[PDB]
Design a protein around this ligand. Structure first.
Ligand SMILES: Nc1ncnc2c1ncn2[C@@H]1O[C@H](COP(=O)(O)OP(=O)(O)OP(=O)(O)O)[C@@H](O)[C@H]1O
Ligand SMILES: Nc1ncnc2c1ncn2[C@@H]1O[C@H](COP(=O)(O)OP(=O)(O)OP(=O)(O)O)[C@@H](O)[C@H]1O
Ligand SMILES: Nc1ncnc2c1ncn2[C@@H]1O[C@H](COP(=O)(O)OP(=O)(O)OP(=O)(O)O)[C@@H](O)[C@H]1O
Ligand SMILES: [Mg+2]
Ligand SMILES: [Mg+2]
Ligand SMILES: [Mg+2]
Ligand SMILES: [Mg+2]
Ligand SMILES: [Mg+2]
Ligand SMILES: [Mg+2]
Ligand SMILES: [Mg+2]
Ligand SMILES: [Mg+2]
Ligand SMILES: [Mg+2]
Ligand SMILES: [Mg+2]
Ligand SMILES: [Mg+2]
Ligand SMILES: [Mg+2]
Lengths: 320, 321, 321, 321, 320, 321
DNA sequence: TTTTTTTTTTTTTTTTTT
């Protein structure tokens, strides 16, 4: 819902412009934002903030709804194909839009490759598992490679010029810039239809920007704010949020029950903010193992997928 | 419960009840538990009218002393919602107790949301099998509600999927203020139809981000205290079980090395004191999960092993052992 | 890049830029990439001054969104440094990529230092033959730097040995703190002259002994992450290719016998994720060496054979086959 | 080198220098190379005092970037110790290089100890005949030191046997901790008189038995890395050749058939990467021995034949061919 | 020096008793023992172990020393005659005390006979190449024969009763028992002057106690510990350690340049641990050939010696 | 010897002694001689239990040092078994020594089996005439055992033929594994009755065919080493003479022509070092045989002439000269 | 009230044949 519909009941265009300058670009943005956030924006009075909230609640349903209606709505929710039938079956149709999907794993585990595949598939038509929308790739490690997008578009029949023109790239150099890029992301989606957000990787910049136990609380608070903004973006625009996470080896030997000594970065903030968490492990050569660690609906299962020159695909017989 | 419309006596008009409903008070119990200052804050109500309403609620809703034997007799017939697992029901002494706030805190994929879905389904099954015979009211703050789980658990328990879904009221809270405001609508709907369960998954998720830093910590704790005061008022009014999930944080300080678990529930003292029962959830092998009673006025501190399956929360299978 | 001497606008004085240079930020890209908190930690910089410095840096250096087509066009003209071996260049898709950290990990005598010397010589040859047309910057931690190799490779590639030696900046790191501090001097040198290569041979040699024990490991990896972040910042600012060598560790856990290679690179996940491209080096027969692309965002996992010669890294001859 | 007494400036008292010497740092280079946290571990030294010491050491000892031509002309005048055999000197490009750790690994009776004795004698002969004009420092861990060999080699080279013996500092290490602690006394002696050679025969012999099993393997290799770092620091400070002998173990896993040698040096990757130059020793016919340059940053992988004689290590004779 | 001298600076008799129960019977043993070895003894704390180390360093010189002083000390060192002038000339005066001498060779090559001769000669006066100390014979093959000692004592004029009473015999039945015997050896040497340790043979028990490729690493680790303990005993008491090693016929015929197809057991551990290694071969009749394979100071040379009823001696003219 | 039942002290029950009995350990001496690792691998035995068993065995069986005078006195009382020939007894210094492994290697039909039969008969005759007064245990592997020889020799020595026959324990080995397993039954039998001789004719006949090729040579010799170790354990435990026969192999390699005898026994160094005494057997004129002491710790290398007769092994007569 | 982290590290022979 466009934010311009709020220009009613004494709400002027200046108020909408000020809200847009503060990172709120849709009616859902005003509806989800708390009253204190509106008050923190300069030039907004308490009464006019209250009337903005009332108008947003009238435009965007904030009340209760039967679970049957929510199930029917989620049945129409778009799922983005990952390019692998095994992975789509594991995810119950692919990457779910409107929810944060976390891909945590060690290096060469295909997280960036899967993100590139998702970035290409977000543009293919809906009938083949696409999203029919532009991608928005947030890169924090410098590991984005448009050659991969060109190859995957060749696999999926997309025009390489059209495929590259429909992928939004911004390189994040620090945690503050990474969070600030979400305002530009919201502004871009308020003008054109997007279908996917990728932040590869979320925790790369937070690792170095905040160092030591003294800044750990600030680091996790900033990460919580960042995924709060990501979840709000997913709610407003219905876009799939795919985030990659680095891992660290658990140096404590007390929990020897766990055969995997590596855990994702971000701690409980990352753990609880992500709707779906996928653990990636190395297979034999191109083989990669994906394990659903956390998911409200998907059972904890493991599937095998492979990385090829044309993107993420199902393992081949010769590779078995 | 006693409907608020019964207060229209001794000169109390319909407009007063309308204003009370607009102020979030939908039952006579709500008026009885509401302090006089809260009634005075409502426009159109004078001091004499406020005290008259208080006296009417007092003579309609008992507020005096009762013998411990009478309270024990009343609690004996209190409904306990089955959790779908015999081990968990034994740990809780019959399941989730209605009329009290039950807190489920633990690490991720520990089954808090799955247990909440199982409780949402079982609140509709007949009382003879540990049900509640009432609608569920699910408040989701993390966007993790999945009606497919409700359908699967209803198939497990024999409930019709359409009936199960139509009897579960779902609302997603996007901020702390909206999370608190949803309770007024919850009370309004409960004043019209019988409910049997309140779920807030999760309470702390929106507060961790809406209030940031030490400066806003006091405001966050005050808002959380208000939210749990409203939840406790709802539980007292409607006798509905309140199940709340809580995320965890890793305690950086290593001073309390005597505790093998470096994870503690979020919310601090307000969270600890507001919850009648707190259950700590840990991951076992495979689908198995460990539930531990951390705080309870009557349940001893003990641990039980339960598992999460496609049909919902249940006891671990022999093949999983 | 954008020189830092363009920041004296909108009330920003030259003295503020002087403190910025003293803090290790020598380019407008450097202050653009540095977070607000890092600017605030510099003495003599206020909140408003740091904010306006950030705004000016963002105006000068594009930090906003850009279409992937533009990024592909920009990367098409990106300079790739030839390694002196056609097989290795084909494996790397043109050679060592500038602006990204390339990691060469392997056991001893596998040619990591030899390949770094070859890259240090080839970074000065003209662009038409795979060069960089820029001075090299060699950071050595094991004391294994040998200018005789540079002279031999320069005679191989036609460079004047005196000019080749004069165009290589060498500094030996004696401790991890000194190794990190050397990057400030590297940035200062690059802010006044064009540099086309960074070599850190080796990154983890000094952290291995500076930090000892499991308890000291966290500080070691935090310092390593800071060092790699600084290297990535240098590569982003100056478009300079960063080539880092890493030693190996034998994996004592024999349960995971599925992997035939018992040697893994040092640094753990910090070095693993910080490096854009990782190349695994193994010894062949005699001069032959095997290079394997363990990790790369765009290069497929493939293995090639290259040899170490008196004149540097080159393709194996049929006589050695 | 720069004596540590030059640090008595800018408020640094004699007590600070005494504590530094007691902590094992006996030169200004030792203070410069040591990290800040290493200085913090010394009692009686504050953080500000450590920063001042680091600044003064960096002012006295150059630590910044230097052009490769300057480093090349500095290494041109570097002293190489003759091994008594022209074949071995040609293989090593002039002899054993000072300021770098040279490793002599091989099977028994292959001449490692004999070559170390020859180097110990030649380090005292004048420079023009390939000497070092400095005292030797022999650290023996197997009890195989034999002054009779030194006397014979001195008679071969014309040195006075009494003078040759008086110029060799002998210390036997009985445990790994004592082996590491001997380096502090070595540095203390070196800061007082000009030395030109350090011999540790052998480095790993004490580590074989001091640490047993895979449980202590990590601690064993960490201690070995600390010992080798300390040796590298000593070489950097005093500009002396560090010659270390290493035992070998026959590799059981014969999976790789490309290596005709079933014996590999002990110490793993720690010793493989710590040693600047590695020489593999094998027995030839009679007194003849085979030396192979396994690892070297500047020397090609080649083999030469040398022999062990009663007067020391020398080239094989025509009668022995 | 006796370990009782460590009872200073607050070190009690209980500490010395615990050290003696742990196999450390001399202050030299405490000095040579590492920090972790001292920490493994119950009843000894961090500060207590450190204080013991400083006291031992004060008593036992552990610092540097000029090579001239060590040369003088080795010049005044005692060398045990082997009863054969040729063998003594080959060894440069006889078996060197304080160093491990390894006698490896085929069967009936004279290793056990030479050990018996050394056991007898360790008691004869110094002026005739003796040691004036008791022998310590550790037998692992059951090949010890006191009749040989009696005959050699008759050759050298010693009283057979005195000769037998001055030889400490203990038969090792397993590798663990063989290693444990060294603690009793140290205890006996701490109270009486010994001059020779014989282990015949070192590798006989290790061959069968550890079997298969999997147990080879543990076998060689235990062997390294045993040889380290032998070297510690030699350093502490200044006694000659004469050990016999059996031989195995190497099957790799590619290295045909070596005319000898038999190599000693123990591999590199025995190769490096032994200060001096002597290869024994049979000559004409009673004559035997001894070859110095490894020695830090003796040239690689061969001499011919013979075995007679009265012990090891030079070959006779009648046997030539 | 000390029976294993005496270990039933300090918490050692019947179960432990039994589990030892099926583990091949039937005496306290067997427990003492067995290493700790061998005790640990036995099922039902804990580390503390194994340590307690070791301490109890050490208390019962003296494992400490002892003066050579005491050893000589004990060996003076050691039993020697007469071979029926004065020449052979004089060559062996009284006959076959008990408690030691005596090897009889020679050409076919040189009397090894006949001498073993004679020893089997003489081990039962009274001690005053060189006997052993104990049962014999014959392990025949070539199938050449003939009880008629035992009957004839018993007639020669005056023993009752039935008493001689039923006092000889026979067990025929069909493969190497069965040959090794038979020693456990031998120990079990000897723990029940007094034995005085063990005969294995022949040791390496079965190993020659069971293991073939270079690959199985290592396993063959390792199994042979285990077998002879067990034989030595039996000899130490029961004080019995172990007499083993071995075939011969002609040395095809004629380069070592210095040895007039081209035949050497099978088993190589394992049999060479495991056998306490080795006797070389050659065929003389007629029925006379030549016996030569090849290896013996105390017997000088000498030869004697003995002959084989119907009544057994005896000295040659004048008519045979 | 708060709020995670983060890898190490080799080893070690063997064993006759006809
Ligand atoms: N063009 C390609 N063709 C085939 N396989 C490729 C190609 N590019 C990359 N790969 C594969 O993908 C791997 C790289 O994985 P990816 O780029 O997804 O990183 P990641 O696992 O997320 O790790 P990081 O933490 O380092 O970013 C390579 O090692 C290779 O196996
Ligand atoms: N349909 C299903 N069938 C079986 N198991 C499931 C299913 N859906 C989820 N699970 C299991 O439950 C886990 C998710 O638990 P749940 O959704 O209750 O989260 P939670 O512990 O409350 O955490 P969060 O804080 O992320 O909401 C999954 O990881 C999986 O193990
Ligand atoms: N009393 C003796 N008189 C003369 N010579 C003897 C005497 N005892 C033994 N010999 C000689 O010594 C040889 C035995 O050698 P020795 O006992 O030293 O064995 P070894 O070579 O160490 O072998 P191993 O321990 O492997 O059996 C006999 O073969 C013989 O030549
Ligand atoms: Mg990636
Ligand atoms: Mg979740
Ligand atoms: Mg949840
Ligand atoms: Mg190198
Ligand atoms: Mg990568
Ligand atoms: Mg040596
Ligand atoms: Mg090297
Ligand atoms: Mg012998
Ligand atoms: Mg040696
Ligand atoms: Mg026959
Ligand atoms: Mg026979
Ligand atoms: Mg023998």
């Amino acid at each position: 819902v466009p934010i311009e519909k709020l220009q009613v009941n004494g709400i002027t265009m200046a108020d909408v412009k000020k809200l847009r300058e503060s990172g709120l670009h849709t009616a859902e943005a005003v509806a989800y934002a708390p009253r204190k956030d509106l008050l923190e924006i300069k030039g907004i009075s308490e009464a006019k903030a209250d009337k903005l909230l009332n108008e947003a609640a009238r435009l965007v349903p904030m009340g209760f709804v039967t679970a049957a209606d929510f199930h029917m709505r989620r049945s129409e929710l778009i799922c983005l194909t990952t390019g692998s039938k095994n992975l789509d079956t594991l995810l119950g149709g692919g990457v779910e839009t409107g929810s944060i999907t976390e891909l945590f794993g060690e290096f060469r585990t295909g997280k960036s490759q899967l993100c590139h595949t998702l970035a290409v598939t977000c543009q293919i038509p809906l009938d083949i598992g696409g999203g029919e929308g532009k991608c928005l790739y947030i890169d924090t490690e410098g590991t984005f490679r448009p050659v991969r997008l060109v190859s995957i578009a060749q696999r999926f029949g997309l025009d390489p010029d059209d495929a590259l023109n429909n992928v939004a790239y911004a390189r994040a150099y620090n945690a503050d810039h990474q969070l600030r890029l979400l305002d530009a992301a919201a502004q871009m989606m308020s003008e054109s239809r997007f279908s996917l957000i990728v932040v590869d990787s979320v925790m790369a910049l937070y690792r170095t920007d905040f160092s030591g136990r003294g800044e750990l609380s600030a680091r996790q608070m900033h990460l919580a704010k960042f995924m709060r903004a990501l979840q709000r973006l997913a709610d407003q625009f219905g876009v799939a949020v795919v985030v990659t996470n680095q891992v660290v080896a658990q140096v404590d030997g007390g929990m020897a029950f766990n055969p995997d000594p590596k855990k994702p970065i971000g701690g409980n903030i990352m753990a609880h903010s992500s709707t779906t968490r996928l653990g990636f492990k190395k297979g034999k050569g191109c083989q990669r193992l994906c394990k659903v660690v956390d998911s409200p609906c998907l059972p904890e299962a493991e599937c095998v997928f492979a990385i090829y020159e044309d993107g993420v695909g199902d393992p081949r017989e010769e590779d078995e």
